[PDB]
Amino acid sequence: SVGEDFPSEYEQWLPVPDPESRRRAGVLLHPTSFRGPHGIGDLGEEAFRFIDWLHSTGCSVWQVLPLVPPDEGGSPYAGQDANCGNTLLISLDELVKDGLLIKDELPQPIDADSVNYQTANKLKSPLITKAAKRLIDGNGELKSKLLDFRNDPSISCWLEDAAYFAAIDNTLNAYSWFEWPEPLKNRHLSALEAIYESQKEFIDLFIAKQFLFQRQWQKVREYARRQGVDIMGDMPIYVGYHSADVWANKKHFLLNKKGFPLLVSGVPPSETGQLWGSPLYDWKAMESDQYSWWVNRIRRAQDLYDECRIDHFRGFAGFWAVPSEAKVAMVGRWKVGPGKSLFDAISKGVGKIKIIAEDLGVITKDVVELRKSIGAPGMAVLQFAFGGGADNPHLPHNHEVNQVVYSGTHDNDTIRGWWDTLDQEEKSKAMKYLSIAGEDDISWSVIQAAFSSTAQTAIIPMQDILGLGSSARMNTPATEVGNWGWRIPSSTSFDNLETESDRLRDLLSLYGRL
Amino acid sequence: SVGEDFPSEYEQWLPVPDPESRRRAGVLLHPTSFRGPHGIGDLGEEAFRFIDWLHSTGCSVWQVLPLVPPDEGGSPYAGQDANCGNTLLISLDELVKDGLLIKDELPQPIDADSVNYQTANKLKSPLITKAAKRLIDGNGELKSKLLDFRNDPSISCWLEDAAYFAAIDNTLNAYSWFEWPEPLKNRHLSALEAIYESQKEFIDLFIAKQFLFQRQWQKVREYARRQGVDIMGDMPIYVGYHSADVWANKKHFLLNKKGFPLLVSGVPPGQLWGSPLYDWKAMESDQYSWWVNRIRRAQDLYDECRIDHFRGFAGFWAVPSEAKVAMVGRWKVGPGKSLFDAISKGVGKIKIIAEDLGVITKDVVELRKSIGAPGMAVLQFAFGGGADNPHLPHNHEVNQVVYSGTHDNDTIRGWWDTLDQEEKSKAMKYLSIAGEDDISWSVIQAAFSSTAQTAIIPMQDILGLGSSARMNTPATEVGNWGWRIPSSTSFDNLETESDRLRDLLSLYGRL
Ligand SMILES: *[C@@H]1O[C@H](CO)[C@@H](O[C@H]2O[C@H](CO)[C@@H](O)[C@H](O)[C@H]2O)[C@H](O)[C@H]1O
Ligand SMILES: *[C@@H]1O[C@H](CO)[C@@H](O[C@H]2O[C@H](CO)[C@@H](O)[C@H](O)[C@H]2O)[C@H](O)[C@H]1O
């Protein structure tokens, strides 16, 4: 009460920092980029080595791209399935440790400066298949865990649909499921039973391969956790038309009576538009079963990652809808998204989640309110900070605490590449704001700025830590060829980055991110 | 409804920046520091020139120290009164424009590289007195405004008390009001009436001089507003014992039956400030009216106001008045948010800055955040300890005022010069530093680059001055509060400094 003495412990009653507010940093590196002899990175020794190296820097976050099966061009964003793992990430050496292969079966190593997906498939698939076959034919512990995995309801609600879809796709020569014969197209029960009988082996193998992915990924994830590293994933808001996700859940999407999309995704114009062409969600239909499809999707995301970015988060508040009949995106309209009620349903369904909102480009007031109402951080990207004036939200003095700052993403050139093509004027702006030593180390200047931010989380692509140029760019949007291929040079091992590790640690130390 | 079309105006529905969140910057400069011929800066031409210069830089905040009558050492923090203005800031030239003096009456100029208060008083007081006398003897517009000022209830609730207190203090030879004879000490009504009769002239002149201060300060304030400059003031949480504030409001303080403080202020290690303390429960019973009036006066003087030792609203150190050292005290519970609720109901929206430096407790932070008041960061304190130091830029908050230093710190150049090596190498890593000559611009730049919404720089640092321009050194009794802009440096002569500031404000979005 007012005017009275405090207890003797008043002087010691200091403010304690909230542990959920802890400043941190991390590295963006997709596992396909790891070194190794089999044409593609994988979840074996290089993953653990990278985790050790990451830990040694003081970083506590590892961000990956979606771990789904990619398209033939390698893209993790136009995947074949929203919940399955990319089986080409499976490590053959780890299969040997599991007793599912022997050393003499391993293929001769190949040089692959960049990932060629066709080549990695030819090399690895037969062996993964053979391992899966031995797993299914065995009795004993590993087989017993396959069964737990298979009969786990949170797995089976997506895994059986995915396996049947893949069995049918394998059996049929057809562009997409729109062209399937009606009983398969529309999942007649006795058609599905007939598929299980006739493609039983394929289905059991597919399931086995997903188990093996899951097992290897969970080991990487538990090892990260033991080293104090959280794993941050990514998911596109939309899924592709030719997938189990759509085919097994037609009523949750905006399709006509024949299963063809009424409306597809995109954004309006600086252009004639941009037509992505994904089917759109039927959000009122989803509302009627408490958003169960999205709840399951997040449950799988939780299973894979500690935290997850959602690409095109703005779509939850309002989305651009183009007539499927159209060739340009400029003919669409904006539709009302589900807003917070979706996230309420997810919370009741799954508990606490950690979502990052990709909120780049021009966005509307409702996007910002939705993001803030669920407490999700947005993004800042230093590479975008030097156009326009001092109100540019990517400039450090405009950063927020509840935010993730990047030097650049997988969609941007490396900092060195970006610097090299930077327009004079943007460059002189940058020179004033950044602390730049030699232009060779331009990537460290940007890294330092990212770390000096008030944003709680700073993420740096591995390409920038390695100071690489444009040829190490992961993706160039709106190109159909030559993306997703980057690998750590075969020369650079995690034993050979002590200087880089020290330099990062010193910066994290200085800006309070350790 | 979910899935339905938005109106056609969706694409244009962009986020608007909130105007209350606008990033800005300003300069700390007390008006006594202005150049001029009369021994001290004043509210005349130099104030308006400075405002013009400030506007030309892009700054939109001018912070002053308390404008109260100071003690004999010049200190605005151990003032004679919490609500009166320092009459020595009154401009003689502005009195000539008001027709209360003529040019021929103005004194010969004197050299005063620093403010000598005794010298400014000898020079200016007779003229201010004479002006006040002509004002009271006149019958026109100006006289009519004096009367409105005098009879305005929001003025008279402090001004009459202050005038009588000063009249008695002038009439009596006594250390403090504790030694006054009982009827004066305890404000017997017929004693006060006797004072009005016998000191009528002194009282009317005192009131007239406060009117003239008010008039000149309000003109400076309006001129600032017209040039897009808000004025930020300061007030110590506590007032001095020998003041009208205590004497006319005894029940609101922790005094014994004889009017001697039971407990006085300070902080532990000790430091004994020795001010009387508030009787917060007694204040509670008239809805904190004393504090409400105080804030009303602060609103009248400033757009925004810092409160020195804000932590005292949540918990305060209380020393027995008996004592010579502060280490034997105890912590007592402050009024918290209920005070600020009362202020809001009384006065409406306020803009308060919490001085929250040093070691502070969890309740201090919660109170500050619950009323939405910004705290402080001071770059000069940022390089001791580790990376969790709250004064480092990466730990700043938006709702915060960042300083390079305050009036209690050395200039950046002076500070740099005495900085110990481990702290100095730390600074070199965080700051962008060129030559030691421009060390103050390195710190200014860091301040401006902060996420803090408001950045304030002492004029000494803009001028790149050393330790001799330090305004105050705490716990010293002599040589403080004297700094003046060198007579050579005019606001016409700071184009380079203006440009350099504008460029930095432009870059960090504070224009
Ligand atoms: C955000 O999502 C988009 C998907 O629309 C990704 O875009 C990449 O992938 C698509 C599909 O493979 C491709 O057509 C684009 O050219 C490519 O940029 C982004 O990478 C994600 O960050
Ligand atoms: C905060 O308030 C204190 C008052 O306790 C000021 O301290 C200065 O003034 C006092 C009173 O004249 C003097 O004793 C100190 O030595 C001096 O530091 C600060 O200046 C204010 O910021």
Short mmCIF file of N, CA and C in Angstrom, two decimals, chain A residues 1-6 10 13-15 23 283-284 287 314 317-318 333-338 362-366 390 396-399 432-433 452-454 509-512, chain B residues 1-6 10 13-15 23 280-281 284 311 314-315 330-335 359-363 387 393-396 429-430 449-451 506-509:
data_model
loop_
_atom_site.label_atom_id
_atom_site.label_comp_id
_atom_site.label_asym_id
_atom_site.label_seq_id
_atom_site.Cartn_x
_atom_site.Cartn_y
_atom_site.Cartn_z
N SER A 1 0.81 -1.26 0.00
CA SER A 1 0.00 0.00 0.00
C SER A 1 0.84 1.32 0.00
N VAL A 2 0.25 2.34 -0.61
CA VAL A 2 0.93 3.60 -0.91
C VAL A 2 1.56 4.27 0.32
N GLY A 3 2.85 4.57 0.24
CA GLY A 3 3.56 5.24 1.31
C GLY A 3 4.25 4.30 2.28
N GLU A 4 3.95 3.01 2.21
CA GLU A 4 4.48 2.01 3.15
C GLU A 4 5.81 1.45 2.69
N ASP A 5 6.51 0.74 3.58
CA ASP A 5 7.81 0.12 3.25
C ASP A 5 7.63 -1.08 2.34
N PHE A 6 8.56 -1.24 1.41
CA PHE A 6 8.65 -2.46 0.62
C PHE A 6 9.37 -3.51 1.46
N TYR A 10 13.46 -5.51 -2.41
CA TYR A 10 13.03 -4.60 -3.47
C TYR A 10 14.19 -4.31 -4.43
N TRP A 13 14.78 -6.78 -7.16
CA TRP A 13 13.62 -7.09 -7.99
C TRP A 13 13.75 -6.48 -9.40
N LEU A 14 14.78 -6.92 -10.12
CA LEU A 14 15.11 -6.39 -11.43
C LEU A 14 14.23 -6.99 -12.53
N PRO A 15 14.12 -6.29 -13.68
CA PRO A 15 13.41 -6.88 -14.81
C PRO A 15 14.21 -8.04 -15.41
N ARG A 23 17.27 -12.79 -28.92
CA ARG A 23 17.81 -12.48 -30.24
C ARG A 23 18.61 -13.64 -30.75
N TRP A 283 -12.82 -21.65 -49.17
CA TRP A 283 -12.72 -21.35 -47.76
C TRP A 283 -14.03 -21.51 -46.97
N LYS A 284 -15.19 -21.25 -47.58
CA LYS A 284 -16.46 -21.46 -46.85
C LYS A 284 -16.73 -22.95 -46.67
N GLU A 287 -14.46 -23.88 -43.91
CA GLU A 287 -15.09 -23.40 -42.68
C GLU A 287 -16.02 -24.46 -42.05
N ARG A 314 -0.36 -13.27 -47.35
CA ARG A 314 -1.43 -12.28 -47.58
C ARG A 314 -2.71 -12.93 -48.07
N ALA A 317 -5.79 -13.24 -45.91
CA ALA A 317 -6.68 -12.11 -45.73
C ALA A 317 -7.43 -11.75 -46.99
N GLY A 318 -6.76 -11.79 -48.13
CA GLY A 318 -7.40 -11.52 -49.42
C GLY A 318 -6.56 -12.15 -50.51
N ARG A 333 -10.17 -10.91 -59.77
CA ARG A 333 -10.66 -10.05 -58.70
C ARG A 333 -10.14 -10.51 -57.32
N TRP A 334 -10.19 -9.60 -56.36
CA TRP A 334 -9.79 -9.88 -54.99
C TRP A 334 -10.93 -10.52 -54.21
N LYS A 335 -10.65 -11.61 -53.51
CA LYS A 335 -11.67 -12.27 -52.72
C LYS A 335 -11.26 -12.29 -51.26
N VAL A 336 -12.26 -12.38 -50.38
CA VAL A 336 -12.05 -12.34 -48.94
C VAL A 336 -11.55 -13.69 -48.41
N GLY A 337 -10.44 -13.63 -47.69
CA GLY A 337 -9.86 -14.80 -47.10
C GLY A 337 -10.47 -15.07 -45.74
N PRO A 338 -10.09 -16.18 -45.14
CA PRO A 338 -10.64 -16.62 -43.87
C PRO A 338 -10.20 -15.83 -42.64
N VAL A 362 3.67 -5.13 -52.30
CA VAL A 362 2.55 -4.27 -51.93
C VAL A 362 1.50 -5.09 -51.20
N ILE A 363 1.14 -4.69 -50.00
CA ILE A 363 0.17 -5.42 -49.21
C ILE A 363 -0.80 -4.45 -48.56
N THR A 364 -1.96 -4.97 -48.19
CA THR A 364 -3.07 -4.16 -47.74
C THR A 364 -3.18 -4.17 -46.22
N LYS A 365 -3.93 -3.22 -45.68
CA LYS A 365 -4.07 -3.01 -44.24
C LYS A 365 -4.53 -4.28 -43.52
N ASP A 366 -5.45 -5.02 -44.13
CA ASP A 366 -5.97 -6.26 -43.53
C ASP A 366 -4.88 -7.33 -43.37
N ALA A 390 13.82 7.01 -47.34
CA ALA A 390 14.15 6.57 -46.02
C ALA A 390 13.00 5.87 -45.29
N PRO A 396 17.27 -0.87 -41.92
CA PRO A 396 17.37 -1.24 -40.52
C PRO A 396 16.62 -0.34 -39.53
N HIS A 397 16.66 0.97 -39.73
CA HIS A 397 15.99 1.88 -38.80
C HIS A 397 14.47 1.77 -38.85
N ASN A 398 13.94 1.09 -39.86
CA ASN A 398 12.51 0.77 -39.91
C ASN A 398 12.19 -0.65 -39.53
N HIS A 399 13.18 -1.45 -39.13
CA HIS A 399 12.85 -2.81 -38.70
C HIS A 399 12.05 -2.81 -37.40
N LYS A 432 26.38 4.76 -48.03
CA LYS A 432 26.11 5.63 -46.89
C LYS A 432 25.53 4.93 -45.69
N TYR A 433 24.70 3.92 -45.92
CA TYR A 433 24.06 3.26 -44.82
C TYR A 433 24.90 2.10 -44.27
N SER A 452 23.00 -6.37 -36.87
CA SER A 452 22.88 -5.18 -36.01
C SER A 452 21.42 -4.72 -35.88
N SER A 453 20.52 -5.33 -36.63
CA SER A 453 19.11 -4.98 -36.55
C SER A 453 18.47 -5.29 -35.19
N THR A 454 17.36 -4.60 -34.92
CA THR A 454 16.50 -4.89 -33.81
C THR A 454 15.61 -6.10 -34.09
N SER A 509 28.22 -12.07 -31.19
CA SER A 509 28.56 -11.65 -29.87
C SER A 509 28.33 -10.13 -29.70
N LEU A 510 28.77 -9.37 -30.68
CA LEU A 510 28.71 -7.93 -30.62
C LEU A 510 27.26 -7.42 -30.60
N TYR A 511 26.39 -8.07 -31.37
CA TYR A 511 25.02 -7.63 -31.47
C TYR A 511 24.03 -8.44 -30.66
N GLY A 512 24.54 -9.17 -29.67
CA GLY A 512 23.69 -9.82 -28.71
C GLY A 512 22.83 -10.95 -29.22
N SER B 1 -18.14 -11.58 -45.75
CA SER B 1 -18.24 -13.07 -45.88
C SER B 1 -17.03 -13.68 -46.63
N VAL B 2 -16.50 -14.76 -46.05
CA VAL B 2 -15.36 -15.50 -46.60
C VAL B 2 -15.61 -16.05 -48.02
N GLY B 3 -14.71 -15.73 -48.95
CA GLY B 3 -14.80 -16.23 -50.31
C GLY B 3 -15.55 -15.33 -51.26
N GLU B 4 -16.21 -14.30 -50.72
CA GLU B 4 -16.96 -13.33 -51.53
C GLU B 4 -16.02 -12.25 -52.04
N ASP B 5 -16.48 -11.46 -53.00
CA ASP B 5 -15.66 -10.40 -53.59
C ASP B 5 -15.48 -9.22 -52.64
N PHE B 6 -14.30 -8.62 -52.67
CA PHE B 6 -14.06 -7.36 -51.98
C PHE B 6 -14.65 -6.26 -52.86
N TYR B 10 -10.12 -2.30 -52.99
CA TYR B 10 -9.23 -3.14 -52.15
C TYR B 10 -7.76 -2.85 -52.45
N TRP B 13 -6.25 0.08 -50.69
CA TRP B 13 -6.40 0.07 -49.24
C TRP B 13 -5.06 -0.20 -48.52
N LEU B 14 -4.11 0.70 -48.74
CA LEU B 14 -2.75 0.55 -48.23
C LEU B 14 -2.62 0.95 -46.76
N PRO B 15 -1.58 0.42 -46.06
CA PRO B 15 -1.33 0.85 -44.68
C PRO B 15 -0.82 2.28 -44.65
N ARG B 23 9.16 9.64 -36.86
CA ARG B 23 10.53 9.74 -36.39
C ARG B 23 10.99 11.18 -36.43
N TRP B 280 1.70 10.67 -0.22
CA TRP B 280 0.89 10.19 -1.33
C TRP B 280 -0.52 9.78 -0.92
N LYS B 281 -0.70 9.25 0.30
CA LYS B 281 -2.06 8.89 0.72
C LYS B 281 -2.87 10.15 0.99
N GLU B 284 -3.82 11.35 -2.35
CA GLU B 284 -4.89 10.50 -2.83
C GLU B 284 -6.28 11.07 -2.46
N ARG B 311 11.12 6.98 -11.54
CA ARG B 311 10.99 5.75 -10.75
C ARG B 311 10.32 5.98 -9.41
N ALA B 314 6.82 4.83 -8.63
CA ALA B 314 6.56 3.43 -8.31
C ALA B 314 7.13 3.06 -6.95
N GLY B 315 8.34 3.52 -6.64
CA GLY B 315 8.96 3.28 -5.36
C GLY B 315 10.00 4.35 -5.10
N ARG B 330 14.76 3.57 3.71
CA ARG B 330 14.02 2.42 3.22
C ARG B 330 13.23 2.78 1.96
N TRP B 331 12.88 1.75 1.19
CA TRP B 331 12.09 1.92 -0.03
C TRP B 331 10.61 1.94 0.32
N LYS B 332 9.88 2.91 -0.22
CA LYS B 332 8.46 3.02 0.06
C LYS B 332 7.66 2.92 -1.22
N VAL B 333 6.40 2.50 -1.09
CA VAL B 333 5.51 2.31 -2.23
C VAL B 333 4.96 3.63 -2.75
N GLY B 334 5.12 3.85 -4.06
CA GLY B 334 4.62 5.03 -4.73
C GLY B 334 3.20 4.83 -5.21
N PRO B 335 2.60 5.88 -5.78
CA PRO B 335 1.20 5.89 -6.14
C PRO B 335 0.87 5.13 -7.40
N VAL B 359 20.00 1.63 -12.18
CA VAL B 359 19.35 0.39 -11.78
C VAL B 359 17.91 0.69 -11.41
N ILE B 360 16.98 0.00 -12.05
CA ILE B 360 15.57 0.23 -11.77
C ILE B 360 14.86 -1.11 -11.67
N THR B 361 13.71 -1.09 -11.02
CA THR B 361 13.01 -2.30 -10.64
C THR B 361 11.87 -2.59 -11.60
N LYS B 362 11.36 -3.82 -11.55
CA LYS B 362 10.31 -4.30 -12.47
C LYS B 362 9.06 -3.41 -12.45
N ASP B 363 8.67 -2.94 -11.27
CA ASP B 363 7.49 -2.07 -11.14
C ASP B 363 7.66 -0.74 -11.87
N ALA B 387 26.77 -7.05 -24.50
CA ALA B 387 25.90 -6.72 -25.59
C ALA B 387 24.44 -6.56 -25.17
N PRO B 393 22.42 0.59 -29.58
CA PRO B 393 21.35 0.76 -30.58
C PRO B 393 20.51 -0.49 -30.87
N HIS B 394 21.12 -1.65 -30.96
CA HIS B 394 20.35 -2.86 -31.25
C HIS B 394 19.41 -3.28 -30.11
N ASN B 395 19.57 -2.69 -28.93
CA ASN B 395 18.61 -2.87 -27.84
C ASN B 395 17.64 -1.73 -27.68
N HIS B 396 17.70 -0.71 -28.53
CA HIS B 396 16.73 0.39 -28.40
C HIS B 396 15.33 -0.08 -28.75
N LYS B 429 34.24 -0.61 -32.58
CA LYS B 429 33.51 -1.68 -33.26
C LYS B 429 32.06 -1.39 -33.53
N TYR B 430 31.38 -0.68 -32.65
CA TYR B 430 29.97 -0.38 -32.87
C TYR B 430 29.78 0.88 -33.71
N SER B 449 20.53 6.85 -36.31
CA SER B 449 20.25 5.58 -36.99
C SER B 449 19.40 4.66 -36.13
N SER B 450 19.18 5.03 -34.88
CA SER B 450 18.38 4.20 -33.98
C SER B 450 16.91 4.08 -34.42
N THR B 451 16.28 3.01 -33.95
CA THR B 451 14.86 2.82 -34.08
C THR B 451 14.08 3.70 -33.11
N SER B 506 17.83 13.07 -43.15
CA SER B 506 17.28 12.59 -44.38
C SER B 506 17.52 11.09 -44.54
N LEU B 507 18.74 10.68 -44.27
CA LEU B 507 19.14 9.31 -44.46
C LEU B 507 18.39 8.35 -43.52
N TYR B 508 18.21 8.76 -42.28
CA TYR B 508 17.57 7.92 -41.30
C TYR B 508 16.10 8.24 -41.06
N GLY B 509 15.48 8.92 -42.00
CA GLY B 509 14.04 9.11 -42.00
C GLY B 509 13.46 9.95 -40.89
#
